[PDB]
Design a protein around this ligand. Sequence first.
Ligand code: NA
Length: 461
Amino acid sequence: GEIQWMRPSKEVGYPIINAPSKTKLEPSAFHYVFEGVKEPAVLTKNDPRLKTDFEEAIFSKYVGNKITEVDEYMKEAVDHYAGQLMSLDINTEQMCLEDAMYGTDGLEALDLSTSAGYPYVAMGKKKRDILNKQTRDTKEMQKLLDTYGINLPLVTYVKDELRSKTKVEQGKSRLIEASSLNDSVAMRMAFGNLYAAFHKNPGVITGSAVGCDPDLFWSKIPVLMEEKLFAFDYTGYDASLSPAWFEALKMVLEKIGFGDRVDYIDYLNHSHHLYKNKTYCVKGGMPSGSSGTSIFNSMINNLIIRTLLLKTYKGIDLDHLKMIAYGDDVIASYPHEVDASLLAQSGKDYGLTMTPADKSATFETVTWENVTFLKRFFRADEKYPFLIHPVMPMKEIHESIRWTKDPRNTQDHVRSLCLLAWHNGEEEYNKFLAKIRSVPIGRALDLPEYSTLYDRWLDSF
Ligand code: NA
């Protein structure tokens, strides 16, 4: 991705967009009970903690576009992935406005807490005022679609979240590029059934895990993998995507029956954004807050891995490439050992910056013992080995419990953390609960004991 130009929104007929300048994150009742070093991300250029220009830092993710056209290796990757998706018999029919708005099997209703984007954010009109779950009324939306149309500017917001001291000082805050409610709705009508098919089929056929439930899905992953695992991290995946990758995605959609609306992908590829009082045009780069962002990033990841394997290992049998992606995150396998370092070398030529899995200093062999997916390790249950525990290290959990964004949600926040933590074992889980109950706020919470969560886990299969 590359920013073509940027300048005052008034010069192109757009208004100044207001965005909060203060974080909602504040120390929680457990701030001094657990260890942690993360703090709220910088949200404004005048943050005292900054040690470099803010705006330059937040837009530096657009490293440019390395490739222009789709080459032979990419075309082969497209044919293979599309062929694989064809076995799913995905309903290519457009989804009706009602379901696209309020959900159906395999697709949750539109989130009412998220931004409605332009022009609603500038008119002070919110989602609450447009849709109603109890009625499932589409009349208001339809009128708004007819009035403002589609392909509207995406509104940029700085993401309010925790980050390492370094990322804070370097102004490396992540951004939310929110599609207008009109575009979100239009894209869900266009691809709603595709989204549902992926959500209902996490695995090695879709090569996707979006919509998955880790507590249950972890036991299914090992059986789908080939003998030798391989993986790697990407540096700024979304923003590094060149226009050619969007064209390859369109080719896949055409081959599976959605050639009808590949134009929606152009909206993602060549897009314009509003940030404060400026407007900018980007060539390439996947927007972070658009309908289908995670699914399309996942599909493209399937294309990327296939392309690099074909380019690096002529004669590779892609029918034995078994991979599962969640956006840029991926767990992959092949019957034979492959060199991730070599694949990373080939990736540079395609505009992708690939590094050792989980921040390793060097590319090491990936094993069931050290592999992670969505930050979770895989550990067989001591009593019933066929049941696989998704294990997220206590470090992330401790960092999280030390802050709050609304005291009213303390109970939900802590329970969510308990659902992740117990997989670390009874000894660790009990220590976690004891620390929580060392302060008044923690003692007033209703939290499940270990045996309760273990029994609930067994009963969920
Ligand atoms: Na873009």
